[PDB]
Design a protein around this ligand. Structure first.
Ligand SMILES: O[C@@H]1[C@@H](O)[C@@H](O)OC[C@H]1O
Ligand SMILES: O[C@@H]1[C@@H](O)[C@@H](O)OC[C@H]1O
Lengths: 680, 676, 457
């Protein structure tokens, strides 16, 4: 057992195991461990640390301590690590269950004493290869845990849940967690694996990795933890003003004329609309990244007319390259494609045999961007829909694929970040200052590349709606403030069905109070294409209509008033977006973000704060026409739908007719005067 | 998608996947699934089923259904399975998250619709080999889960916990679970893996296996579930009388004279003592399985004097075979040893380079038994301490070891069952009835081989005591009624330390109300052997004394009264042991076993029932001199220590002086008269 | 298909596969290939090359060519490589059997056209890991092949033989071959593997590696090839004069008295004797690296008398460290031991449970040297018997052991070179010139560390 200490770094070593703990921003430490000769140069999501104020390394009781403001790490003589805040409260301790550790007998008075033989930093060597990593920590009885990204499950607090650390359609692993004990932790490792916050033990796992790497931070409030995390992995940029308005989309406007008729119809009805969208397969083949001139005869004319109308066009980008295209040949020559480890060299079989571009290859990123620049951005398109961003392998056999940076098992989760990066850096280089792209997935730090994330191809049910609410709130805690969904969900909504229409309205009403308000879906009844193939290329179907007038008159009136409300909220939304850019605060956030000292704020999962001034209580059940709403203590609240003033610190039994979900405004906030509050 | 239905069997198939559901005892079904050409012949823990008269297989719309009494299974046209009780209530449903399944689009109105692509029955092919199995089930927000064996954790209800399906010192995987929703389930698969009862999904995993195999049972009460499980995997036999008395042990009586002096001191003071124990390294070398005559000059004379005193001798058995022994040579010739897949052919390095005998090899079982028969059983020893039963690899690299029945990844967890079987079958064939052996580990069905399990080499702390209460209760739920601990814990207790002495008293008081009352440990200050080596063989140390007079007179009086109390309890213990044999009920039970209709019985984890008539509320903290005790509704309760009558259905603040823990007797139960 | 050419380097690339060919000494080329982003910094046995002044790089038709004195490499537009001497004679040709390669159809008039689909440079990805390498070359009907090291087989010419690229007691993989066609080739890769010079195809194999790396040289005579190889991997030093005399040894002189009785009896009979040897287990325990004073009560007096007699003492060094020793404890603390990947942490069980010192770890080399220096070299011992140099695992499960430089599968064969290096560098640092140590095993370049190899048990 040997400490190698300096005035601002704590190293411990035994039998080739090196543990290194150091400052990494105010109130924060980075922890790395390896059994390789040295630590490698991989920083993954961590940006360079701003030098720390008042770091102190010391020795006591055969241990070493490193303090960095509000956090301290204690490594004992057996190499066992625990973290404390400035008040001496335990935040996080390693889980050890051994009788012999670091060449020493374990202390029999400790819960660490056990014949089971579990290590807290298990770097299990893979034969012929690298290491399978398990980092074990003790569970704590009181601990509530948030963040981790976007998971399809009805749990805000994920203590007791196990999350796959992998990217799949409708899932985003963004492995920053925030704990009710007053710390946050980033698992700074893009390897395929798992995090289980089991009641009996916390275990983070990487299938293949070179070393343990995580970042841990402490503060007295959630807001400070979020700010410290944004300083560590990057701030969201400022949202462009157009992105706070209404986004109209469906699967799919098949032609220029079809898309333009929808846009004109919105303007004819004097309805708000800021973005309209050309979904996938508007192109000749996958990997061409251009409009098919047969269905889209004059894209610049479309874009020019849309600009007169005050509407931005977004276009679908797919990361797939079909093996019959010119770009396949060139990208294959240059090694810009992902590779199958075994079997046929095809990563996806949707409407052709395609291979994903390698978003971890800087050359590939630049190649794909410059195709998009030439064929889209140069025409005035300022938003890209970066779909299939995981990427969506036809079969998720992560072991069978390899990237520029290594096997998908080792580096796979960073793919969506690189995909976002390709377009952000490219667009910034082309002179665009405010950049937002719609990403289906993300990793830690994706926020810095202007990633507006949406929750993918979920089904159209109340079950899904509930899952999306939890996922979006957890995404915000994981540092992704720009987040949205397909209003109505993606799959299964028949436009004539009363059950789906009710879901649509509830989801739309929630959508008004999401970071971005975006209507999209694959509506039934679907329509097969006229011809199944053209030039040997399989043709893409479309769903039914998905405009706000497509669901009858009564529903149109509700959705129209939702659009008008969203317009009135735009100034507030932009203030909250600025605060996200400035402070790392999420836009939609759990009640505990704004009211951390109130017990109920840590228990309630079916309410949230849309910025600091608006309390939202969505309706998550079919048929429900009332619900209970807790009003936080510390201010009075104005009921948006009735104008009644309610004191904080009580439960209200709120009416929830089909026409409105319960929403309350913080009394005397600037947003109160910006809204029209009717008296009923 | 194709159903193949008969009068008593449901089969579903698509793309080589075969799902087979059939009756397996009353109110029970066996579920199997494979992508191999056919199901194999491995039954593992399941005994032959008594034929069910009431089985009914039906087809309706696109689905098929099989009912066996109080359980039914429905399989839809997409091969997705859920279970219901006789009232039609959901017990358990598979977890599917796909857009396409069984050649069909998934229903978009169902929570099963998802692009994530998780199957409920994932048989993932291992390249060049067999399958990595994951069986996924939906979680339920109100589901509380018990059993699974013996885990070193402070949780009775294990909903939210993840348990490793592996055997290590102080852990036993016995993978039967009982749910508060009204079903029990056996994972009938000995593969290394894991069970995660996570809030978001339940996942059972097997690292290497040929097929999915589980057994599920339904009843309106826990008692019926326990009974149905015992019919599935085997009844505990009848406990022999002598096992209900006091078992005296320490690490370690180094000589015949040392052991005999302790027994003589117990008799000199007219104290109860039923079993005395010779711990490990009383032998010349590992794999000799005999007394070393230098320290044990006349074993027959020891056993005869102990018999005159009314005491049975138990002896340590280690499954290790040192490579310098004659038995290593012969066992190596016959192929009766465990094999390392890679590296030096050594499985443990404790006091020698040893290799474990293969408890899954029927020949090796017979060989080891016949050695123990010749050197011990023929002398009159009739209890064996089957230690290191996991077995305790120096390094738990399960992938690096192989048994007769296959790689340890595929079959490893059945080792302790085979180890118990070797001795139980051997002793039965030698004419012994009512067999009991002290096993350190178990698998499903170990109870049928007379396995008294103890919780291994835990530390001597109050934290450990708390874990042991939970583990023992969960072992009973998993069908292991004969269970015990080292009173005082194993490791770290200094006999002169007041703090340890307090723990010892609290643990002893609890041990009186355990299925077996057994004093053991490795007490400080330890003593190194005089000679480190003798004939090149590393010599084993000892701990300090561990007799009831070794901790002063005040503690002596307390433990003496504990032994006298245990003797008065013996007829009740034998009644509860017979009930365990007859009905599969545990001996130490969670409150919900006897009071399943009462909410508090499913919440309280620091009280339990010692049989149906005694409520026990252990003191689990240093310095504590009182505690809250919930008294179940439906009977009056008699305070064991005051004789006071208390009505059921209330919380009482109970006196808990150092000299007694709170214990209550069901009013008018036969044991009331027996105890005062 | 793309060539990236400079005046002294040929690079070809397609789909991330990079092939790099460059001069590496007179009449010699280095060949490397990888599918990683770039070539790594591992040179293994190759010393830095003296600059070649007349190197000529050209492109013609769809091909490219690099000439360096007596050798030239030609790479066609499909990335297929062949070597020629100054007379235009074919030396070595890659083995390809495909219908489609480097994005192009294969030529149907060539023996390379085949549905079999074998590549000459097969970097087969290991799932979650690195690469399994096979480098295939055409066999040639009258090629005779020599070198490769020390194999227990009655064949000087090894055309038609298959040699394991692994170290075992009585075997040494030193993977430099000399062909009768007039070239030499070093497989500059320490991975566990195989070289088969089969009549139908030549295949070099590496179980685990990051990249292909070999060195190839051409000349009109063997003597020139041997000279060019010594310039590439290092010259043997000058042998000390005592090493040409008679070395007397047995298993084993157990005591100081027994050894000295033999030495004196050689002198009493007026017989020549230059070296006498103390074999293994003259020490208290494995990893102590000192005389046991019970059997060897005054080592200084022994060495001084042998010096008067004109005799050098050599002593047995074992690389094993028994787990009861003080050096085990310290070497474990510092990470200076070889590690088992699975199972008991024991690499050899001969007369105790021992773990090998990691001869690929620079710190461990220095640690073991300094023990031998304190206990042997400071007393006047000038020769070390570096036994068990493979090292001799009780079980040769190469997949189950890992070194400082990586898994034994990737780097294992360089261990005996590091073991030699530890003592050579240490003795040189202590002021000794003309160093010779008795090594049981070797890799390419072991000669530069004064390695007198013997053929084992
Ligand atoms: O949102 C959808 C996206 O997730 C993908 O499946 O491509 C079509 C889009 O409509
Ligand atoms: O209980 C102990 C057992 O678990 C093992 O370690 O052998 C010695 C016994 O005292």
């Amino acid at each position: 057992s040997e400490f190698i200490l300096t005035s601002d770094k704590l190293v411990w070593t035994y039998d080739g195991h090196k543990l290194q703990i150091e400052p990494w921003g105010e109130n924060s430490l980075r922890v790395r461990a390896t059994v390789a000769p040295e630590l490698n140069g991989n920083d993954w999501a961590l940006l360079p640390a701003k030098p720390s104020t008042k770091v102190k390394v010391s020795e006591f009781e055969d241990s070493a301590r490193i303090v960095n403001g509000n956090i301290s790490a204690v490594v004992n003589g057996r190499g066992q690590l625990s973290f404390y805040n400035q008040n001496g409260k335990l935040l996080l301790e390693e889980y050890w269950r051994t009788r012999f550790v670091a060449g020493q007998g374990e202390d029999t008075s400790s819960k660490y004493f056990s014949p089971l033989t579990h290590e807290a930093r298990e770097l299990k060597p893979i034969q012929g290869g690298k290491f399978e990593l398990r980092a074990r920590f003790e569970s704590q009885p009181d601990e509530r845990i948030y963040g981790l990204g976007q998971y399809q499950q009805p749990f805000l607090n994920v203590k007791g849940c196990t999350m796959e650390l992998a990217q799949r359609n409708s899932q985003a692993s963004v492995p920053f967690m925030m704990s009710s004990l007053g710390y946050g932790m980033l698992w700074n490792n893009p390897a395929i694996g798992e995090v289980s916050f089991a009641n009996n033990v916390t275990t983070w796992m990487a299938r293949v990795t070179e070393q343990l790497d995580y970042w841990i931070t402490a503060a007295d409030t959630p807001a400070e933890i979020s700010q410290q995390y944004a300083a560590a992995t990057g701030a969201a940029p400022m949202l462009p003003d157009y992105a706070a308005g209404f986004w109209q989309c469906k699967l799919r406007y098949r032609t220029q004329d079809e898309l333009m008729e929808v846009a004109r119809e919105y303007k004819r009805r004097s309805l708000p609309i800021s973005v309209i969208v050309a979904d996938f397969f508007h192109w000749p083949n996958q990997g061409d990244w251009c409009f098919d001139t047969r269905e889209w005869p004059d894209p610049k004319a479309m874009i020019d007319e849309l600009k007169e109308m005050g509407i931005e066009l977004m276009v679908s980008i797919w990361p797939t390259v079909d093996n019959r295209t010119e770009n396949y040949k060139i990208m294959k020559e240059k090694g810009y494609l992902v590779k199958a480890e075994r079997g046929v060299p095809v990563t996806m079989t949707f409407l052709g045999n395609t291979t994903f571009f390698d978003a971890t290859h800087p050359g590939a990123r630049k190649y794909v961007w410059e195709q998009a620049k030439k064929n889209y951005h140069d025409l005035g398109i300022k938003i890209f829909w970066l779909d299939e961003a995981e990427p969506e392998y036809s079969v998720y056999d992560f072991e069978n694929y390899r990237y520029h940076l290594g096997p998908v098992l080792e580096v796979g989760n960073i793919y969506p970040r690189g995909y976002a990066q390709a377009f952000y850096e490219g667009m910034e280089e082309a002179g665009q200052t405010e950049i937002v792209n719609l990403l289906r997935c993300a990793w830690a730090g994706s926020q810095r590349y202007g990633a507006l994330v949406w929750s993918g191809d979920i089904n159209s049910t109340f079950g899904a709606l509930r899952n999306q609410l939890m996922a979006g709130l957890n995404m915000g805690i994981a540092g992704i403030p720009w987040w949205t969904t397909d209003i109505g969900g993606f799959d299964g909504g028949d436009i004539n069905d009363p059950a789906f229409q009710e879901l649509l309205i509830r989801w739309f009403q929630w959508g008004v109070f999401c970071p971005v308000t975006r209507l999209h879906g694959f509506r039934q009844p679907m329509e097969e294409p006229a011809e199944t193939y053209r030039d040997g290329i399989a043709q893409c179907m479309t769903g039914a209509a998905n405009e706000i007038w497509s669901y009858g008159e009564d529903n149109y009136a509700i959705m129209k008033s939702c659009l008008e409300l969203r317009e009135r909220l735009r100034p507030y939304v932009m203030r909250v977006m600025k605060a996200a850019h400035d402070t790392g605060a999420p836009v939609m956030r759990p009640l505990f973000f704004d009211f951390p000292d109130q017990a109920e704020a840590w228990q309630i999962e079916d309410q949230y704060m849309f910025g600091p001034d608006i309390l939202v209580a969505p309706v998550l059940e079919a048929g429900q026409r009332s619900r209970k709403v807790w009003l936080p203590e510390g201010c009075a609240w104005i009921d948006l739908n009735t104008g009644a003033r309610q004191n904080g610190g009580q439960w209200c039994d709120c009416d929830a007719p089909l026409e409105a979900i319960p929403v309350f405004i913080r009394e005397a906030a600037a947003v109160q005067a910006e809204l029209s509050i009717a008296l009923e």
